[PDB]
Design a protein around this ligand. Structure first.
Ligand SMILES: CSc1ccc2c(c1)N(CC[C@@H]1CCCCN1C)c1ccccc1S2
Ligand SMILES: CSc1ccc2c(c1)N(CC[C@@H]1CCCCN1C)c1ccccc1S2
Lengths: 353, 353
């Protein structure tokens, strides 16, 4: 009934290059993260991961699976099923699906079986297809303002109960059976080898791994930049996921001369695919972050750094003023370079194995 | 919470020609049969089945798996595991194991998935290796007077509870985890796709299949044979399994002249491998039947017809007197032929598909 440690990996794929884009992963990952954080889990929550990235993530999660620890692996995205095998489809995989570009569940399972963990939860919320392993395999992605998936809708309600994981997983499967969409088709399949009364609400009693997590989720301190013209800018930061950071720009001081100005953030490194057409927005929802206008200050300009695991070099970006007073007809610009270092998951380079 | 019908198939392999003989199947099958009979299940309980027999049994069980019925399939014997596949080993299979001679679990499963049954329980007690399918896969055969297997030891206690099958299967897995032999190794693995509150204790509310079961388990009426010398013999019958019948011979009348006699049963058809060295025993335990001396009359001679599914032709056997009085020095014999018809499972010929 006790855990040596509690570590979880959460993968959500929402933006496919060559397959249909998915809406549910973002909320399910965010919501399940904070819920496991409540259960004292050192969670890594990653969005829109490629083949090589996914592979590196899992291997790194598997390394933490020492004797008596509690592992949780949640994947929400596209799935594939060929010759009784199932695969987790990454964002880079081309259409049609091919196994060489995907992650075989059966293999992940084979590696998990070679473990001495007191509990290991393998959750899959797939679309369009003793180690004490508790395998939960859902097949429904037909999901307020924001979309929550059918599996998570029920998983969240029961996740905080002090009952055996298999008992909750069985109740969530029946809960789905009461719902109209999930009664028609049997989306949930459970596979257990759990010999003891192990729950997700179980205390821990080696805390060096807690310090390694803190190091992996360090957000840059709020910075202020003074410009030649006099205007002083505020640079704020917020964490959304392990690989997703929101950047905000506000104006602290404006002299009576300046009638219109706003600091824009640009020239982010090439490795992260951020298109200027989706940055420096009016509200943070426009990006769009799970983070709502209320938890971030109003009158700012927002930019979301979606892919941080691609940060090979220290974060360097330029900020522009774009200030014009009605007296003069032409718009003027002044710019300066900022170094934010290696934020969040970017600290540990995703490269390589 | 209701069943269209409740049908179960129980296979136990206890006497291997080319692999180690097993002791537990006999009690587990007998004990689980009567327990499911209590739960209003039309059970067929078969012992020591070959390749072709096993294959025919399963197919015939699968044909009963119509919409909303409750199926239960219990196999206790040797198992085999090659390339992630598991196999049920029949009695005729040679050593080493070969798949062509065995029954792939994965295939049985594939066929079960093509069903509309309200519940389908697949139990396996293997050694030395929506359809609402509840797959229970045990791997421990290191089992009063008679041996009861580790899985059954706990399965029987919980089998009569009005709780969801998956909940009981989870409790039996934990019960095993409390036991010393079953805590060391994780023998039980559960796989469920059960979306609704379906239990083995569930009422039925099409009863033509009940009449077909009765027909399949008709035992021959107790017969008496009068001999030329005067001595009258009693021929009794008892059912042990669907394919296993106990035959008993007693003496009703003996004139004052006869000082020693006993009716021996012989010349049973060749298809059933009964060796005279194991027939006409002092007590029924000597055969040995699960049936104890107390439920059958004392002072009889017992013969067990182990394999009845091999009965292609009406049961014909000869009975001999073997009577000698101390006055005369030589032992005399008189014999007559008896037709018992097609008893128990022998009524429906196991041949062929
Ligand atoms: C601490 S709590 C925690 C829980 C889940 C993950 C995780 C950390 N990390 C950091 C893993 C460390 C980093 C240092 C070397 C050894 N590894 C195993 C990951 C990192 C990269 C991809 C996926 C994951 S999964
Ligand atoms: C009635 S209740 C019941 C429960 C489990 C079995 C069973 C009957 N029978 C008789 C099956 C009938 C006989 C007539 C034709 C259609 N079939 C499907 C078997 C017979 C032979 C091998 C295994 C089995 S399994």
């Amino acid at each position: 009934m006790l855990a040596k440690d509690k570590v979880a990996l959460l993968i959500g794929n929402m933006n496919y290059r060559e397959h249909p884009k998915l809406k549910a992963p973002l909320v399910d990952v965010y919501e399940l993260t904070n819920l496991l954080r409540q259960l004292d889990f050192k969670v890594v929550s990653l969005l829109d991961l490629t083949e090589y990235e996914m592979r590196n993530a899992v291997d790194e999660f598997l390394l933490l699976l020492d004797k008596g620890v509690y592992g949780l692996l949640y994947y929400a995205g596209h799935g594939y099923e060929n010759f009784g095998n199932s695969f987790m489809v990454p964002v880079d995989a081309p259409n049609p699906y091919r196994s060489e570009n995907c992650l075989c569940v059966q293999n992940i399972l084979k590696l998990m079986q070679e473990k001495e963990t007191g509990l290991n939860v393998f959750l899959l919320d797939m679309c369009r297809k003793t180690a004490n392993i508790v395998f939960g395999y859902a097949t429904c992605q037909g999901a307020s303002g924001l979309a929550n998936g059918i599996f998570m809708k029920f998983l969240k309600d029961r996740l905080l109960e002090d009952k055996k994981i298999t008992v909750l997983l069985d109740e969530v499967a029946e809960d789905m059976g009461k719902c109209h969409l999930t009664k028609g088709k049997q989306a949930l399949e459970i596979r257990s080898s759990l010999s003891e009364k192990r729950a997700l609400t179980d205390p821990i009693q080696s805390l060096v791994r807690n310090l390694q997590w803190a190091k992996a989720h360090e957000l840059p301190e709020s910075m202020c930049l003074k410009f030649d013209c006099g205007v002083q800018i505020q640079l704020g930061f917020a964490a959304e996921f392990s690989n997703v950071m929101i950047i905000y720009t506000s104006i602290v001081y404006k002299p009576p001369e300046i009638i219109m100005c706003d600091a824009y953030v640009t020239d982010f490194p090439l490795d992260l695919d951020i298109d200027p057409k989706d940055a420096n927005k009016g509200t943070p929802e426009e990006t769009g972050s799970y983070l709502v206008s209320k938890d971030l200050p109003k009158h700012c300009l927002y930019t979301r750094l979606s892919s941080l695991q691609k940060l090979k070099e220290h974060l360097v970006f330029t900020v522009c003023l774009s200030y014009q007073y009605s007296g003069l007809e032409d718009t003027v610009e002044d710019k300066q370079e900022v170094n934010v270092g290696k934020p969040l998951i970017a600290k540990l380079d995703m490269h390589r194995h």
